[PDB]
Amino acid sequence: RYDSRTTIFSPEGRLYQVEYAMEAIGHAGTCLGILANDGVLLAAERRNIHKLLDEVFFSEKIYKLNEDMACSVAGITSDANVLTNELRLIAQRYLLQYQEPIPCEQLVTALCDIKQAYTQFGGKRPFGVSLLYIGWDKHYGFQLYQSDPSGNYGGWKATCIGNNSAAAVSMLKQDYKEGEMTLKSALALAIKVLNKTMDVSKLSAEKVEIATLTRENGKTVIRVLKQKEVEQLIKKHEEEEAKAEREK
Amino acid sequence: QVEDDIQQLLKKINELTGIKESDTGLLAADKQTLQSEQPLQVARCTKIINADSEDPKYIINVKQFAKFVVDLSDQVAPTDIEEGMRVGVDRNKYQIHIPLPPKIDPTVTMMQVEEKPDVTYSDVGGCKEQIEKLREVVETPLLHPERFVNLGIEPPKGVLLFGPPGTGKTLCARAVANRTDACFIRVIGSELVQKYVGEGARMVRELFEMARTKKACLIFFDEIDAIGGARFDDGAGGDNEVQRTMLELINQLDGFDPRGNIKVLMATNRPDTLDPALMRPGRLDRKIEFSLPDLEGRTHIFKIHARSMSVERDIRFELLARLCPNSTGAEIRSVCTEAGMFAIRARRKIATEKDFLEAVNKVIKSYAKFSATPRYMTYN
Amino acid sequence: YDRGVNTFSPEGRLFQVEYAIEAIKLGSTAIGIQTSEGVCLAVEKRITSPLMEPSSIEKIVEIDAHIGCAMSGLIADAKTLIDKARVETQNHWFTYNETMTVESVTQAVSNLALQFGEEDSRPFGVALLFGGVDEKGPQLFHMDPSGTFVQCDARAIGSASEGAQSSLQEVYHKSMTLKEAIKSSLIILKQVMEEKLNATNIELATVQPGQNFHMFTKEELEEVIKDI
Amino acid sequence: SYDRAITVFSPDGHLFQVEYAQEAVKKGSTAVGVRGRDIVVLGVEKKSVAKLQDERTVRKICALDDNVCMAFAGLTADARIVINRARVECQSHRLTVEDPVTVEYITRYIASLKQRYTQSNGRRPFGISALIVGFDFDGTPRLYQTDPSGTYHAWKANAIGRGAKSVREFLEKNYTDEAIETDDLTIKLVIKALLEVVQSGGKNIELAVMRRDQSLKILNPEEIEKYVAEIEKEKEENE
Amino acid sequence: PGTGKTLLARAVASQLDCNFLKVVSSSIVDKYIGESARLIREMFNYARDHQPCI
Amino acid sequence: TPNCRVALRNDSYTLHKILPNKVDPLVSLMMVEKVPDSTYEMIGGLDKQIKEIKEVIELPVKHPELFEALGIAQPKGVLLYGPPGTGKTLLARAVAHHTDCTFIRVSGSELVQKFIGEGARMVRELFVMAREHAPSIIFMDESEVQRTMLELLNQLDGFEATKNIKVIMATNRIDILDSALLRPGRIDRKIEFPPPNEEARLDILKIHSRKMNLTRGINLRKIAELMPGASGAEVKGVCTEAGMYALRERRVHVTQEDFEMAVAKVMQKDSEKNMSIK
Amino acid sequence: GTKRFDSEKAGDREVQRTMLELLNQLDGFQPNTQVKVIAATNRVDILDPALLRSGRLDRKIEFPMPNEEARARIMQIHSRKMNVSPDVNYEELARCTDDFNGAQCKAVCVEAGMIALRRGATELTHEDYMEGILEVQAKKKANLQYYA
Amino acid sequence: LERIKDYLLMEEEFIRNQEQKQEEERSKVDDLRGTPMSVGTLEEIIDDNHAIVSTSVGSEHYVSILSFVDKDLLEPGCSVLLNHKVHAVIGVLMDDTDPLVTVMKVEKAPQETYADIGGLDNQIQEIKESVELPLTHPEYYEEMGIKPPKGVILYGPPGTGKTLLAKAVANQTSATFLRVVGSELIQKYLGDGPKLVRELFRVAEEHAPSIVFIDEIDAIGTKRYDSNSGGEREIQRTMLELLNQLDGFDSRGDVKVIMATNRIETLDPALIRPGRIDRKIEFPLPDEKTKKRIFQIHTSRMTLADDVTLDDLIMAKDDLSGADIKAICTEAGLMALRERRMKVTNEDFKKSKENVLYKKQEGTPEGLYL
Numbered sequence A: 001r002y003d004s005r006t007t008i009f010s011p012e013g014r015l016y017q018v019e020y021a022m023e024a025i026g027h028a029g030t031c032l033g034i035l036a037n038d039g040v041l042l043a044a045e046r047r048n049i050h051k052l053l054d055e056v057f058f059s060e061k062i063y064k065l066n067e068d069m070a071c072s073v074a075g076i077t078s079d080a081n082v083l084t085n086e087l088r089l090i091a092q093r094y095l096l097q098y099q100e101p102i103p104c105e106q107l108v109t110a111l112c113d114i115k116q117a118y119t120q121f122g123g124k125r126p127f128g129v130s131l132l133y134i135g136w137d138k139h140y141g142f143q144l145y146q147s148d149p150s151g152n153y154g155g156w157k158a159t160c161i162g163n164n165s166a167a168a169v170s171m172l173k174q175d176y177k178e179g180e181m182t183l184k185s186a187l188a189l190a191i192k193v194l195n196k197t198m199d200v201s202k203l204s205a206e207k208v209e210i211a212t213l214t215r216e217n218g219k220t221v222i223r224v225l226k227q228k229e230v231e232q233l234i235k236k237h238e239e240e241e242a243k244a245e246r247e248k
Numbered sequence B: 001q002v003e004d005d006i007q008q009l010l011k012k013i014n015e016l017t018g019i020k021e022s023d024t025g026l027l028a029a030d031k032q033t034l035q036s037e038q039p040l041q042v043a044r045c046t047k048i049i050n051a052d053s054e055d056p057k058y059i060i061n062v063k064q065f066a067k068f069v070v071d072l073s074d075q076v077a078p079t080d081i082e083e084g085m086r087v088g089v090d091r092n093k094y095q096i097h098i099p100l101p102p103k104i105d106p107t108v109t110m111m112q113v114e115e116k117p118d119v120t121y122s123d124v125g126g127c128k129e130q131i132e133k134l135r136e137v138v139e140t141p142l143l144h145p146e147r148f149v150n151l152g153i154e155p156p157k158g159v160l161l162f163g164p165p166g167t168g169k170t171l172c173a174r175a176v177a178n179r180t181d182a183c184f185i186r187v188i189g190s191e192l193v194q195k196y197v198g199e200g201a202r203m204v205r206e207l208f209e210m211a212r213t214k215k216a217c218l219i220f221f222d223e224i225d226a227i228g229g230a231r232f233d234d235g236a237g238g239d240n241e242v243q244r245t246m247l248e249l250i251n252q253l254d255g256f257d258p259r260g261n262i263k264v265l266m267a268t269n270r271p272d273t274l275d276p277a278l279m280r281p282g283r284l285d286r287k288i289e290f291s292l293p294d295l296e297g298r299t300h301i302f303k304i305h306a307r308s309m310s311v312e313r314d315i316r317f318e319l320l321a322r323l324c325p326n327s328t329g330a331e332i333r334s335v336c337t338e339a340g341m342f343a344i345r346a347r348r349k350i351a352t353e354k355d356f357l358e359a360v361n362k363v364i365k366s367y368a369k370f371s372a373t374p375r376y377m378t379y380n
Numbered sequence C: 001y002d003r004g005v006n007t008f009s010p011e012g013r014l015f016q017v018e019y020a021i022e023a024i025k026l027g028s029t030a031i032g033i034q035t036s037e038g039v040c041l042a043v044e045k046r047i048t049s050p051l052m053e054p055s056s057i058e059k060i061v062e063i064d065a066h067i068g069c070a071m072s073g074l075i076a077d078a079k080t081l082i083d084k085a086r087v088e089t090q091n092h093w094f095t096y097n098e099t100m101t102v103e104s105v106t107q108a109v110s111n112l113a114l115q116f117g118e119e120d121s122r123p124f125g126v127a128l129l130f131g132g133v134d135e136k137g138p139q140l141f142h143m144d145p146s147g148t149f150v151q152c153d154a155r156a157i158g159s160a161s162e163g164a165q166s167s168l169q170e171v172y173h174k175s176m177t178l179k180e181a182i183k184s185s186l187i188i189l190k191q192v193m194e195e196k197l198n199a200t201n202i203e204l205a206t207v208q209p210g211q212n213f214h215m216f217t218k219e220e221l222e223e224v225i226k227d228i
Numbered sequence D: 001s002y003d004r005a006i007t008v009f010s011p012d013g014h015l016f017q018v019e020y021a022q023e024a025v026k027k028g029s030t031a032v033g034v035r036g037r038d039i040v041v042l043g044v045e046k047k048s049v050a051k052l053q054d055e056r057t058v059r060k061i062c063a064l065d066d067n068v069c070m071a072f073a074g075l076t077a078d079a080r081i082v083i084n085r086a087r088v089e090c091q092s093h094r095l096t097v098e099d100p101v102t103v104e105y106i107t108r109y110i111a112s113l114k115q116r117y118t119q120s121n122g123r124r125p126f127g128i129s130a131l132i133v134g135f136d137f138d139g140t141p142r143l144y145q146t147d148p149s150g151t152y153h154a155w156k157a158n159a160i161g162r163g164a165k166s167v168r169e170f171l172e173k174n175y176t177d178e179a180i181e182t183d184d185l186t187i188k189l190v191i192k193a194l195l196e197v198v199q200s201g202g203k204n205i206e207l208a209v210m211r212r213d214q215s216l217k218i219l220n221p222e223e224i225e226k227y228v229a230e231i232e233k234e235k236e237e238n239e
Numbered sequence E: 001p002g003t004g005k006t007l008l009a010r011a012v013a014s015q016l017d018c019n020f021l022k023v024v025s026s027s028i029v030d031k032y033i034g035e036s037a038r039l040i041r042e043m044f045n046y047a048r049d050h051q052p053c054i
Numbered sequence F: 001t002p003n004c005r006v007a008l009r010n011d012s013y014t015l016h017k018i019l020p021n022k023v024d025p026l027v028s029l030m031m032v033e034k035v036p037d038s039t040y041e042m043i044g045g046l047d048k049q050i051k052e053i054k055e056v057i058e059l060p061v062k063h064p065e066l067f068e069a070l071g072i073a074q075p076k077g078v079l080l081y082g083p084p085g086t087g088k089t090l091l092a093r094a095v096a097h098h099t100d101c102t103f104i105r106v107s108g109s110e111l112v113q114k115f116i117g118e119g120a121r122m123v124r125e126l127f128v129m130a131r132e133h134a135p136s137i138i139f140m141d142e143s144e145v146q147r148t149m150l151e152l153l154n155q156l157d158g159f160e161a162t163k164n165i166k167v168i169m170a171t172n173r174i175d176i177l178d179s180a181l182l183r184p185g186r187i188d189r190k191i192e193f194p195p196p197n198e199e200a201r202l203d204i205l206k207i208h209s210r211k212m213n214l215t216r217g218i219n220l221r222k223i224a225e226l227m228p229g230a231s232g233a234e235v236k237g238v239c240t241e242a243g244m245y246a247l248r249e250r251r252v253h254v255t256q257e258d259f260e261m262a263v264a265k266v267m268q269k270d271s272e273k274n275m276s277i278k
Numbered sequence G: 001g002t003k004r005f006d007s008e009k010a011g012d013r014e015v016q017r018t019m020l021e022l023l024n025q026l027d028g029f030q031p032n033t034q035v036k037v038i039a040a041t042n043r044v045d046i047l048d049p050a051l052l053r054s055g056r057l058d059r060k061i062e063f064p065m066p067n068e069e070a071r072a073r074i075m076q077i078h079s080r081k082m083n084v085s086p087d088v089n090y091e092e093l094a095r096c097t098d099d100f101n102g103a104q105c106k107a108v109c110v111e112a113g114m115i116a117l118r119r120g121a122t123e124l125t126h127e128d129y130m131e132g133i134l135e136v137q138a139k140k141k142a143n144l145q146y147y148a
Numbered sequence H: 001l002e003r004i005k006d007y008l009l010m011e012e013e014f015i016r017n018q019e020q021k022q023e024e025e026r027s028k029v030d031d032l033r034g035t036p037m038s039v040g041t042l043e044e045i046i047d048d049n050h051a052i053v054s055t056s057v058g059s060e061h062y063v064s065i066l067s068f069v070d071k072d073l074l075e076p077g078c079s080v081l082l083n084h085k086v087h088a089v090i091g092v093l094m095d096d097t098d099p100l101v102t103v104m105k106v107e108k109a110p111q112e113t114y115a116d117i118g119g120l121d122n123q124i125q126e127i128k129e130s131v132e133l134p135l136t137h138p139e140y141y142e143e144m145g146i147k148p149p150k151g152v153i154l155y156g157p158p159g160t161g162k163t164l165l166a167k168a169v170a171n172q173t174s175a176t177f178l179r180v181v182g183s184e185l186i187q188k189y190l191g192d193g194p195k196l197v198r199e200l201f202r203v204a205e206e207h208a209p210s211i212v213f214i215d216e217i218d219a220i221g222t223k224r225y226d227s228n229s230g231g232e233r234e235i236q237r238t239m240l241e242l243l244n245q246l247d248g249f250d251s252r253g254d255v256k257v258i259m260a261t262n263r264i265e266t267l268d269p270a271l272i273r274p275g276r277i278d279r280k281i282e283f284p285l286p287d288e289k290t291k292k293r294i295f296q297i298h299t300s301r302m303t304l305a306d307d308v309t310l311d312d313l314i315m316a317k318d319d320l321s322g323a324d325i326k327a328i329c330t331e332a333g334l335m336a337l338r339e340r341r342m343k344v345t346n347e348d349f350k351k352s353k354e355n356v357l358y359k360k361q362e363g364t365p366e367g368l369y370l
């Protein structure tokens, strides 16, 4: 009725491509991050777990963007390549300008202004990509951020991806943690969330993806960890399911 | 339980009240002329097909049965038992006795106005030139048949009127019917829309039968979308008989000996649903619309709708006409009555300026107008 | 259909221009009157709130030291045009050491009253009343959105401008005086406004050749209103 | 016309999309602002904490200069862009003109940007309405408001967002000229406005003031709690 | 349309003369729309008399 | 009565006797006698739904006193929905044989209206006979045409008659409907229909397979845990494929291995790729 | 002659009966060289392909609307009956009038007479015809503006 | 004990509904008539004691008149009583109409006055001033020469009590009343629009000052432009018939019309003009001040433990109808009746508030202005 282009307003006034970009988020890979001090982690779901791929890339959703920041991603894939190139270029231009790493919030607002430049103008497709942010600074420590196709960014401590992850956010609230900064506790919580939310029976470790970010002595290393610790984490969580069925 | 008491003994005395009536339950111009009229006869009216030569030998149909071969009775006028005359035929002698009038259909006489409703020419203000053209259409050829002759021109025997709802079409109709002097005929469009096959066609026949009886008569159509101007037809095959009636109306209306001393006014809110088998001039010769009067007409409609209601003798109508951006006489009269209701909300003897201010609010600014509150300055 | 600044009508015409002339009608009223003694001018503010600070609403702005103005309808097209008129009269004084006369001002404005074109933006939605004192005495000027600029002896704009013109043609002639024209304007004002006339509703702007400076009356306007 | 696009007038003389981009402001969160005589005050409602995040980044009240303060309604991204451009513009005014920035200048810039943004081909209008409160010339407190049309419009108090008619009606039914400010009366006036909010949950209140010489002070919701308690005490004294 | 449509259609038909009927195929698009198939039966079950039918 | 059929004398045209039963061909829309023989117990574990249906239909018939001496109305508007839509018909037939009440199925469609006939086809004269058979329940599959249903809402909504005359609409996919149906003063109990869990799939398995001669050494919860959210449609289908496995053998004996192949007998695709993107 | 409507439950029958007997008496069956078939209709796509079939009505007489000279010829034919003002360029009328039929030009003639009768003119004038053109269309005044 | 009283009242009303000549002159009337009487149609009356009639089969006869009452009462257009012997014109037929006149005539005021809905009394005050004032207190209309309004449209979100307003005005009246669901015209009958219309309004004029109440025809406002390529059915013609019946000719008389719709923009704006229909009334989602009154009415005669506050539920969420409040007040009572308990606590209201409110579900912001 008032469909035609991204511009102009609807008669209430709401937006068309904004709601539909959100509904383009909802059918994508599920991500989350956790509340942790002395480190921060990411979780990700493998789309297309078919047997004839290569996995030689070591990272399909994580993008180690500067040195001490990576980002997960969700949405239309090749727009995210367009976004990651530009994001790396923005942070690297900042480092060129000051010789100090980017303190991550003006990085987030730069990308939000990039996305908003296609929200206002006409006629261009808005970026249908929401994506996460982990990172470290001199001013707040470990951080977590949620980009949105509107240009809004919300600093969370426990985040939200689309229709697959509302029950995940419900579990994050009903299983809210505070004070426990131990990475292994957060990993067990993430294992519990992805066990419930993903429909992978018994949570095959090839269908998941976990990357962490710790502060080591002055380096802020990013640990895109290997598969054996994921296997024993799954075994840990299934032993804790045996503890949960000690109630029978 | 006091309410139980109340309702119980109420209904109990009501039961007594029922028991009251239940226990209290315990020819000269009409009768002696009856058997005299009982040897009369149920003899049928008919309609005559033809006349043979040198003899009646009349063939006849009534309505439905067959086509009846009859005689005449001996005490007839054998001259005028011709075709097109309904006559009375016996149930034993099978012979014509008494003629009858034709199928007059006195529901077609029922659409004639038969009265003169009063809405004066001094009430229809705002359109002093559209009504001037319609005055040229109606009053002048019926009063001064000189200048058509003395210049060699034709009368506009059909005038369509179109425009927004609320405008004055009805007023102009009953206004010329107020000062008519002629035979004025309202036409409900759905007086043509009868049930059975080929009858509204005969309704157009009844119309032209009434028309060509007399002189200078006035057929007034209104709401001809009910008659229709849409030849809406593709592979669905639904409603089409009204279009047959309407094409019959066009046939007997205009082309191959049209009306004569007949002036027809039509009206429609929907001109874009018409048929160009009536849009052609010769049929409809003035496509007169009305439009919204600017301020002078709106002040004039204020004058007409407030000359006969109690107001202050200080109020103007310039500012009130201003706060009617786009409005009609119906909306103006609603403002008058609404301010009257506000005068009933107080206890006044007359109306004031602010009465009509809040009535203008109620009508226009409290119209629905969607959606809805226009609260912005940007202008002032 | 008609849809668009680049399509005529079967009979005329725009239909974008006409909708702009329609868009005039929503504004507040204003009345300016030429008198050989000088140009007077008045307006109604239509104040909404008590918090709505009355001296911040602009209707009469200052173009030159002897050239006044009034606006109508849309506010921001008027803000653009006022800005440009200020810049260009200053340019005339720059390259000529003299005052750009009021007809030349309004020619400079209506050079791009219609330069509307989005390719090769929209037409403006404002009527303007110009008063000033050139070498030919006082001048009163009226333009439109379509740039069809004309001189007027006593023009009224915006809302209820018809009866303003009618009752103005009732009272006006050629040899009026100043104060008579002032009260002759504000009588029409408190016939076309809805509220009671007081100190905060209206504002005057009078320019005289010997009183070129200060084209305004400030709260002696109270004394003028109480004389009716 | 039609509701498409920004360039066509209505058949009765309107622009649909200017009235329609005000509706997104009309359907936003509330934020008020008054001027006292020496201290200026404003604040937003609807902190709307979702139990699991930080909120120091979602702040709707910021500043462009050391003298001026912001507020908005509508959608927040246009507020982010307009605030970003306003900082640059205020600093560029500081570049040439060596004054502290007058409030009237930055409001003319915002409204001018907003209108030349609205005129052009298919640029979506900024669905915000800002409140620009400041005191520069001899410490004279001023507050102006904006509009999607781009009309800066000086007031003495203001209410925007959802149900602003009731809130401004409270400033109409309160708004006493006496006395004076009296910062205590301005503080209590903020307390009465926030008690007169559309919800007035008691914990969703966020207010910040400026005493026309200092910088912005973000309060603590215990001082505001005692403020609500003494407002309730005066309400009991009404009985 | 007219050298290979309606003309030059009845060449050998003039010579053969067995069961040469016409169907202009407007007579099947009926009023009671399922009379279409009934008139298909009425086409064939009236045709197969002149035994090699056309 | 007004509108009363009668018997006429055939020599002087006087009345003979009243012809009662004003009923038009609308018991031919009722069509409820011998619906099935009674089947309450055949539901796999939706007992909360059945208890709410009992205390929305029969409890208003049993104890209207206990509503209105407690001073509340009795609920009449029941919409049934589930996200797949299963058990949508069997629960109707289940309720239908356990109430001893004039049940009615109007599971047809918005037919005639102006196509070969007059129209007035949802409850137009059906409510007259809901009066004529005063305890009654109406059932429908189902938003589709736009004035008839509206008329008949306004016959059903409040201003109708003595209640205990309930309507059951039962379909999937709520959001395809108009803007008048979902009034809560018009539909008073909207119950969801979840696809079942492991225990309820086990129960439905027991229900259908109880007449199926299952051999020995046969576990069933394993079959239930071979079901990744089976709605109840294919739960019947697994048992029918097990019966087909017994039929293709000339046997009457079913092992658990038959179900191990029968679960495998159900999988469809929706395979294609170069479409992950997203 | 109706397109045979492809719908059930009802139908007027004698339209088909008179149609079949009209085509029967007309052409095909009972041919005769003393039938001169004249017929005129508004629209064509209501009709049946059996109404022509090979030559039932083989001669088609369409009518393009009057091109240039016919219009002023028609206006001259209608103005022949009246008190002509003989300084009326009918070719100017043909230059300005477009997409008009014979009947609309007759209406121009009658409305020009009546518009002259509004001032009671003895003979007509040219802008009487021009306002006849405007009033035949809808009307105009002119308002006028933007034409200065 | 009161139930015995109400049953006896209803059965005695039925008894009263069951409680509903000449020794030889009436027998002569019985021979002035043939007992199988019939219904005919006068075409003309040649007044010399024999008339011409018309039958439902169409046989039209010179039939003699047998007057007991004044025989000049019946007219051409009025039916007669004809025999089967000679179809003798018997006499007095009081003018009867269709069966579909008593169908649309409610004979009761089964519900109650303005004390039934909770709080809208600005526009309830309007319909008050436009029906209750012109009927009962018709002073100032004559006494200031101003005519009362005629048409009232109800609209807004559904379930506001449009039906409740209808039946409330159907209480407080002495004028005769009619109940018409006006969408009943779905036939395959050409014509037959004006039959119901003309007979309805003729009946309305013949009885009394009355209200002619059309209810829910918001679908039938068919856009006033066409039907698309082929449409025309009858529906436009029937609504145009009603339009001409309302504000054409033939002066309206003392006839009132109140109308109600759910959606309003899909109507026909050839009706919504004033004069044709005068008043329009918004019924929106009210407030949080008369929700207290709607809960007050719905907790008038129910067993509520007064510890609980319904104002907590009113403070919870703010946009829902009064019908939703009725659904909650009954549903929490059922939740109390789970286990044979006396009164209702808070959590039954909580579960019932959640239960009834499964209506609005969208999605996904906004939510995100923000």
Ligand SMILES: Nc1ncnc2c1ncn2[C@@H]1O[C@H](COP(=O)(O)OP(=O)(O)OP(O)(O)=S)[C@@H](O)[C@H]1O
Pocket (backbone or CB within 6 Å): B123, B124, B125, B126, B163, B164, B165, B166, B167, B168, B169, B170, B171, B268, B269, B301, B304, B328, B329, B330, B333, H247, H248, H270, H275
């Ligand atoms: N100049 C006027 N003076 C007085 N009343 C007027 C005037 N113009 C219009 N009216 C009102 O308009 C009515 C006549 O116009 P209409 O009733 O709208 O004709 P109409 O049949 O209703 O048109 P439509 O399109 O069919 S609804 C009058 O009865 C008044 O209510």
Ligand SMILES: Nc1ncnc2c1ncn2[C@@H]1O[C@H](COP(=O)(O)OP(=O)(O)OP(O)(O)=S)[C@@H](O)[C@H]1O
Pocket (backbone or CB within 6 Å): F042, F043, F044, F045, F046, F085, F086, F087, F088, F089, F090, F170, F171, F172, F204, F207, F231, F232, F233, F236
């Ligand atoms: N509770 C249950 N107990 C036993 N069988 C069930 C149950 N629910 C569903 N089924 C079976 O699964 C199927 C689904 O039930 P139905 O309601 O009849 O089908 P349906 O798809 O729901 O019909 P619709 O939705 O009205 S078209 C039936 O064949 C039942 O045998």
